[model samples]
Target chain A: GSQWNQLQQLDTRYLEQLHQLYSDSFPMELRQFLAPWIESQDWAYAASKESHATLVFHNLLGEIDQQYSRFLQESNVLYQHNLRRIKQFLQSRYLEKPMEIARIVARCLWEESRLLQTAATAAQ
Target chain B: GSQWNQLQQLDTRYLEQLHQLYSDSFPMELRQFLAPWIESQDWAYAASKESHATLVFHNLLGEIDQQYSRFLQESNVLYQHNLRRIKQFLQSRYLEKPMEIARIVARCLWEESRLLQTAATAAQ
Candidate 1:
């Protein structure tokens, strides 16, 4: 229940509901980009191990840049700036706040995943 | 050590140094508004417990309005709008997320207090 285990198991069959789980609360584009990586691990596993949590966190930021860049029209300056600002917002107060990063990765994402899973269930 | 005990104990004697402790990182206005209440209690006391923490959390929001209302120019619409937006930002995704509220109350305030405590020590 704590993990996104069911989502991963049944995602192929429920991609629409999966996409419906995100909006301004959690972006669908980002979810699609990080789906397998995010769904596979236990939230607490990432949260409890500080070093590993940060590694996962660092991976998330790069994934953001990569995914957004691909979606961006080639070399569009404003989109790059917007993406930089988005990443900067994520990085803010988090450089030394390793635990905060862990909280965000584990809690916020887990919360959204749980919400989607709930919706995915109710839709059936 | 985890509490803002030192900051509270020495605040009057080091008021000048205390002001220097804040910047854009942690708003000085907020510290001034919540000073005694924030520094007097143990953060873990609030964080480890839930209902009491949200009560503390509720008081904080009201304090925000009371302080900001006094600071605002009589009845300026734009300023009130800005204040509302600020409060809304704090409220975002936090309605059902009770623990998230506790985390913010304890962790964010504690981290800032620790920073100020660091500065207060270095001053003398």
Candidate 2:
């Protein structure tokens, strides 16, 4: 019954049509091979797995988008993480009494901006 | 054989003493880049070019862990021809339909429970 319902929902021939539409959209090199199967399947399933896969694909599309929104967002988050690291480094400098406080502050700010650039290229 | 083995290993070191680990990790970025070569491999005699590469990495790892009790579980019981899609949305929140209820599930949860505060302080 389930297989029959899946068959009813899916047109096997739709594989060719969907392939023409979405082949370029998938990030995987093996995406062409997967198209036919996706077109022919009834994907309705348990909530977590299905939603998780959908979110992954949606985020993947965002990733593949020339704008690379998700990729940039992730990089921004990593940049923030590194900035926190730099802040910790500066705080430790104050603990080192009579150290070159001014040089350490300036260097920390410079390093944060450089980390931002590193984060940018990592997205690209 | 060794050149083939190294190529097969897919190890491209970035710098001396710097190995980019996670090349084998199932991150999405590298997965996309891997598509074309996987397509060109002689996968037909093995299966469809698709299925062959789909499971080769698993089989290769299986060989290394042959003595392990879990080694035999490496094979994908599901076939490329039998691809399944899963679809889901939050029930009682996103999807209007009454669906499967959630439960607090338990699996092998490995928490990276290292003392980050101590590490940060020491690096300071």
The candidate that wins on DockQ is 2
Please provide, for model 1 over B61-95, each residue's C-alpha lDDT reduced to its tens digit, 9 standing for 90 to 100: 77768855654435332233334444665576444
Model 2, B1-100: lDDT tens digits are 3211222222122111111221222221221223343333343333323344335534422332332223123322111111211011121231221111
Worst 10 residues of 2 chain A by lDDT: A21-30
Which candidate leads in lDDT?
Answer: 1
RMSD of each: 16.3, 25.3
lDDT of candidate 2 at residue B23, scale 0 to 100: 20
Regions of model 1 farther than 4 Å from truth: A1-29, A72-79, A120-124, B1-124
- Lowest lDDT sum, 10 consecutive residues, model 1 chain B, at B73-82
Candidate 1 C-alpha lDDT tens digits along A1-124: 3334444444333443443444432343344446676676666776686786777778767877885666354433223333444567667755555556666556656665676666567765
Model 1 clash tally, residue pairs: 0
Q: Give me the runs in candidate 2 sitting further than 4 Å from their true place.
A: A1-11, A25-124, B1-6, B14-124
**A19 Cα displacement, candidate 1 (Å):** 11
Q: What is the lDDT of candidate 1?
A: 0.53
